Symmetry: C3
Subunit: 147 residues, 3 copies
């Protein structure tokens, strides 16, 4: 999955960004089973004042998380995932949940590429990884934080 | 809804951004009935020269509006909404409509979060808001511009 | 189509961006038949360190291509398109494919606007263009690079 996270300039310190990334990544891994290295958190920063709510320009305290996943999960699991991302980012970013927005977009796996290759159908990460060469596995494994 | 608006650096003044946000927000409210504070306009700015059309690098006069809505509206209402956003942004940004692109993405409400909570199924904004506490309502109401 | 391309600051030179745009644009045109001027490549740049994989902060060598298309193509054509974008960007950006991610989002044509007007249903670009005035055609034709 790829989580595009929209925030204002310097609202999240390098340290805060890592926490948020870990929170998002861990929540995903926990509720979906998908492997850590398969989840991306992309911070897109803009100047405070570029976000508008109901037409009222905001300050630097808004966070919009737009998640891109593979088709396949139930409404129940997605709801939990969303809820978990809200709680976890709230804590990780030290930001009240009222300031948090989250949208989930889904797509067919056969049209999703990570690490230059096609993702497996949900629940097949197993044989997908087994067929990979040790070079590609070693590379993917460098991208896992288990704190 | 969340309207991601991609434009070039300093093509829209703070003043022009507010106008556009109001135009987008008002159009949405008018054709969907959704409340003002429930609509977000997020300006994502990049240096002129980052947009390419047919392979030809552009200047600072392009605008791409990517709208994220809840599933449920008809093709007819969406078409009108899109058309309205084109006319209204054209006027608000003082930009010829030939320079305007608009895409609408839809998602199930049960996987969309605003103000830290789940959005209601279209046409239920009513009881959703009635169940909210006065603290959460007061907060949402600060984000409404009725000019 | 609109291809949002997320990269780190100064990882792609003006020259490299044009190559990538051409690669993306040409691949699209070749596998879909859609006209050059109808494809947009939008570079969204951020500071290196804003991308996280599995919770591990990355450097400036990641590329995420998020493509927005019209509903209608088969899984087979999309797969080929994706594969082609990976190979072609890899070459154009001089970046190993392991660093490349690609997602395709689809939407109904009747809710997609380019050059201020509604896109035609796939395979109708023909009469769509024939009904256009010479002013609008001349404008669109300036955005085509056939190198």
């Amino acid at each position: 999955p790829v989580y595009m996270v929209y925030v204002s300039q310097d609202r999240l310190t390098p340290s805060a960004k890592h926490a948020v990334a870990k929170a998002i990544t861990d929540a995903h891994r926990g509720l979906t089973g998908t492997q850590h290295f398969l989840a991306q958190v992309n911070f897109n920063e803009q100047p405070a004042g570029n976000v508008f709510l109901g037409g009222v320009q905001q300050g630097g305290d808004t966070i919009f998380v737009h998640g891109l996943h593979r088709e396949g999960r139930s409404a129940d699991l997605k709801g939990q995932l969303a809820q978990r991302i809200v709680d976890d980012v709230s804590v990780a970013a030290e930001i009240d949940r009222k300031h948090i927005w989250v949208y989930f977009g889904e797509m067919p796996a056969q049209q999703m590429v990570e690490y230059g290759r096609f993702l497996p159908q949900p629940g097949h990460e197993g044989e997908w990884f087994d067929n990979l060469s040790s070079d590609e596995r070693a590379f993917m494994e460098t991208n896992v934080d288990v704190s």
